């Protein structure tokens, strides 16, 4: 769409929004790729962060990484234009 | 698929038309002399 206010969190800022961003934005955070982020993208829709921490099948070390990356991580309303492109998104460089 | 032929009715014209053209050409050739020559080409028609 022409107008979309919830797109500084698709990799343009520090805070990363789930269920609307590609797997490439988890490469900025060490230890969040290609593991962990796979669990985030597979079970995409979340209400907030705690829903991701509970519904995701995260092991204790993965939970330690999640505890390492609380503040640069959020969960907003899902947009189907970005849900369908959370694995490839057409970016390759 | 030989010669792109999938139906056997397609073979009837492909074989038949050259036969008729060969019949006309064979009349023409039977009108000819048809003995060997020693030249680059045959000037007899």
């Amino acid at each position: 769409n022409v107008e979309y206010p919830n797109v500084p969190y698709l990799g343009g800022s520090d805070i990363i929004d789930v269920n609307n961003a590609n797997v490439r934005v988890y490469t900025r955070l060490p230890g969040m790729y290609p593991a962990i982020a796979k669990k985030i993208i597979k079970r995409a829709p979340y209400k907030d962060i705690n829903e991701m921490l509970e519904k995701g099948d995260f092991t204790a070390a993965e939970k330690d990484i999640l505890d390492k990356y609380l503040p640069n991580l959020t969960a907003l309303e899902p947009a189907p234009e970005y849900v369908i492109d959370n694995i490839n998104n057409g970016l390759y460089r | 698929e030989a010669l792109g032929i999938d139906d056997t009715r397609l073979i009837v014209p492909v074989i038949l038309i050259p036969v008729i053209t060969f019949i006309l050409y064979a009349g023409f050739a039977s009108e000819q002399d048809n003995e060997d020559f020693f030249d680059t080409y045959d000037q007899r028609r």
Partner: protein, 504 residues
């Protein structure tokens, strides 16, 4: 028989019918001038000279009428925006009707000279053949042109007996026809000094008058007569075409680059005023001077005239049009209604941002916002790409100072994107689109169209000059060569090439 491309060579040795066809061409040109003026008066809108001047409406001969005095109309209006109670005869309509009558008179004269071709004046008293004493004719015409140039520059331009020429200020705000005193120093060769016009015409008229006296008085040398083929009129044609395309190149340059003879209130601004930020620098200087007097931004930007902000706009750039985007400039972006004011773009932290202006090369330019340092702080994505510095993310807000939207602050993203896309083009204006059904692609000014037409005409007349010089210097071998060429083309047969007396 004659080919189709040689049908006019029948008047080459017929002076009476040569004068007749010249009269017919002159009548056609004068009639075109009159009819073009009448059509432009039919399609001209004199209501708003500030935001809809004559160059926005595609007027072509109206600028040339307004350049040297004719500014009023019988309808009661002037191109300066004033009201004229008593227009007088020499209005736009008066000039057009005078040109139509002149065309008719020249047409009748052409008829007479075509019928009465065998005048005794055109026959040589010595030989009896139809001949023209071209050097003395050139002397007479040079004397006449010197008299006309001196009179124009001494009475018309100076206002001694005449209206003067169009003189504007440095930024095209207050321009009118004024008497012009000549400048005889080196400052008369400043092309943006209108005093140079008067001084040039006076001095060149005097020199041309003296040279015409000389050319009437003195016969040409035999070496120059044989070398330049002065008995043949095609050398006159060749040299005249050469001088004409020289003059066409000169006028093309002075139109494109601008001079005092091509003011921006008649032909529009130049592309180099947009490239250098001429009007932008002037507007910023005025705003800074008003801010130094204790005014706030609203009062400083409200003091900027609408004409000055209208000049600082890329739609008025002559280098933004198209070859086949025909029509007036109002057929493009539209008819300008109002100046919306200067947009100032602020992010969520209050830092000011300026949209980078579109260069004249680019049909489309990406919308990017830079800070005072020059770093990209916000932009608009291309069409649908994932973004990092978008307008919605940075939260860019735009506040307008001056103009119609003075004091208003827009914070919603679609409006901010719209106004940033407008500010990419320069000053933000309001355009009317339903009057002429404007498509939305920029069109060139009369300055640009004049430059295009006359550059191409000069380039083609260079070829014409080459052709006629060739036909002049090679008249004896026009239909081909003979058997006297075979001996000359032998290598080393003669010492000097082409000379039979230098045989080895």
């Amino acid at each position: 028989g004659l080919p189709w491309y040689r049908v006019h060579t029948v008047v080459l040795n017929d002076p009476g019918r040569l004068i007749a066809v010249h009269l017919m061409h002159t009548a056609l040109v004068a009639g075109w001038a009159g009819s073009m003026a009448l059509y432009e008066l039919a399609v001209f809108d004199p209501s708003d000279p500030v935001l809809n001047p004559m160059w926005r409406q595609g007027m072509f001969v109206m600028p040339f009428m307004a350049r040297i005095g004719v500014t009023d109309s019988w309808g009661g209006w002037s191109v300066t925006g004033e009201s004229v109670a008593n227009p007088g005869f020499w209005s736009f309509e008066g000039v057009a009707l005078a040109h139509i009558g002149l065309s008719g008179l020249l047409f009748l004269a052409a008829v007479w000279h075509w019928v009465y071709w065998d005048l005794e004046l055109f026959r040589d008293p010595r030989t009896g053949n139809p001949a023209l004493d071209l050097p003395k004719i050139f002397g007479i015409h040079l004397l006449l042109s010197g008299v006309l140039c001196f009179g124009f520059g001494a009475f018309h331009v100076t206002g001694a007996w005449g209206p003067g020429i169009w003189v504007s200020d440095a930024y095209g705000i207050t321009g009118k026809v004024q008497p012009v005193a000549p400048a005889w120093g080196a400052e008369g060769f400043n092309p943006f000094n209108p005093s140079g016009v008067a001084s040039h015409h006076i001095a060149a008229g005097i020199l041309g008058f003296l040279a015409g006296i000389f050319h009437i008085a003195v016969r040409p040398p035999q070496r120059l007569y044989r070398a330049l083929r002065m008995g043949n009129i095609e050398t006159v044609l060749s040299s005249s075409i050469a001088a004409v395309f020289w003059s066409a190149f000169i006028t093309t340059g002075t139109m494109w680059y601008g001079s005092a003879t091509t003011p921006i209130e008649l032909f529009g601004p130049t592309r180099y005023q947009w490239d250098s930020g001429y009007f932008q620098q002037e507007i910023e200087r005025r705003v800074e001077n008003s801010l130094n007097e204790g005014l706030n931004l609203s009062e400083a930007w409200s003091r900027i005239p609408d004409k000055l902000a209208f000049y600082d706009y890329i739609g008025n750039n002559p280098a933004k049009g198209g070859l086949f985007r025909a029509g007036p400039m109002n057929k493009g972006d539209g008819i300008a209604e109002a100046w919306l004011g200067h947009p100032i773009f602020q992010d969520k932290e209050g830092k000011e941002l300026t949209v980078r202006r579109m260069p004249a090369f680019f049909e489309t330019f990406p919308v990017i916002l830079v800070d005072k340092d020059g770093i990209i702080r916000a932009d608009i994505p291309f069409r649908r790409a994932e973004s990092k510095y978008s307008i919605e993310q940075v939260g860019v807000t735009v506040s307008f100072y001056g103009g119609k939207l003075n004091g208003q602050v827009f914070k919603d993203a679609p409006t901010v994107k719209k106004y940033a896309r407008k500010a990419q083009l320069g000053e933000v204006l309001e355009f009317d689109r339903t009057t002429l059904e404007s498509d939305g692609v920029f069109r060139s000014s009369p300055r640009g169209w004049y430059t295009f037409g006359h550059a191409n005409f000069a380039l083609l007349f260079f070829l014409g000059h080459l052709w006629h010089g060739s036909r002049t210097l090679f008249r004896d071998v026009f239909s081909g060569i003979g058997a006297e060429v075979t001996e000359q083309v032998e290598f080393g047969a003669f010492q000097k090439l082409g000379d039979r007396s230098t045989k080895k």
